[PDB]
Design a protein around this ligand. Sequence first.
Ligand SMILES: *CC(=O)NCCNC(=O)c1ccc(C2=N[C@H](*)CS2)cc1
Ligand SMILES: *CC(=O)NCCNC(=O)c1ccc(C2=N[C@H](*)CS2)cc1
Lengths: 10, 10, 140, 140
Amino acid sequence: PIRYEWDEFC
Amino acid sequence: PIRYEWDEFC
Amino acid sequence: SQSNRELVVDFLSYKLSQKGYSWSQPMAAVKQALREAGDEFELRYRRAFSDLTSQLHITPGTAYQSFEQVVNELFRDGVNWGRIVAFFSFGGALCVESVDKEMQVLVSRIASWMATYLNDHLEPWIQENGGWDTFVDLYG
Amino acid sequence: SQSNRELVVDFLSYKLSQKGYSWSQPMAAVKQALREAGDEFELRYRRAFSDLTSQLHITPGTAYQSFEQVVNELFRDGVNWGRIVAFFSFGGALCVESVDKEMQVLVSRIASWMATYLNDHLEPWIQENGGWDTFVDLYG
Ligand SMILES: *CC(=O)NCCNC(=O)c1ccc(C2=N[C@H](*)CS2)cc1
Ligand SMILES: *CC(=O)NCCNC(=O)c1ccc(C2=N[C@H](*)CS2)cc1
């Protein structure tokens, strides 16, 4: 689940 | 015993 | 002994580089990618990151359990690579804060906490998601 | 695990340095002094050093015993710091020679030989002659 702004940072 | 040129290199 | 082996590796890598040859240690590329990812993370997510660092102030009295509690919230519904970079940046921020407040001695303690939390919680996820080599190629 | 602990140390040292703080690892000064001593040694003693490096060519077939024999002559009547720098420079020269001859795979083998010979023969002398800290201050 997306909870943080960095959750899609690769 | 001194055997090498580096034997007094500190 | 580990100390004497690190000295050997350091000297030989230095000498090989000096003669135009690169003896790359297994984790060199991982360490570089993680330095770069942490820098980018702190530059992209300053406000969100400050909300994470505000959740814990370490003093000489602090137990691992307090660190584990805050990091467990970061990973409560699972692990991803962005959360791993946050974890490293978080530990960095706690070490900088420690040195600011003249508690240098806590840096090695925080390092041991991070290595513990990596061993227990993150390394088993890493091994089933491509390893640190995948992280290197994802960060580019 | 050792790997994950090295990653933590690397990241935290990097981050602390970035913020103006130096987290010095125990062997940092030793590794630097030995890089500098080996450079000075190879510049001062080029001819004598070539007589030492001429005594051994390592191939994939070579056993530790051949390395040990040549290094035992260097230390036959005892250890001194200059002979320890020669030992490190010797191992460097063997690794460079290996890479020249497209036998890169031998570098980790020579590294293990050096760490073995340090453990067995040199470390017990080091411990009774002031430690690596004395070597650091002698080289200046
Ligand atoms: C940004 C990145 O890491 N790209 C890798 C591919 N994405 C995943 O492997 C991945 C997707 C989602 C999750 C989680 N979902 C909920 C909390 S963590 C983990 C990994
Ligand atoms: C150059 C240096 O290492 N200075 C340290 C003081 N000298 C010694 O501790 C020392 C003197 C002599 C010897 C040996 N004598 C015969 C072969 S080795 C070792 C150490």
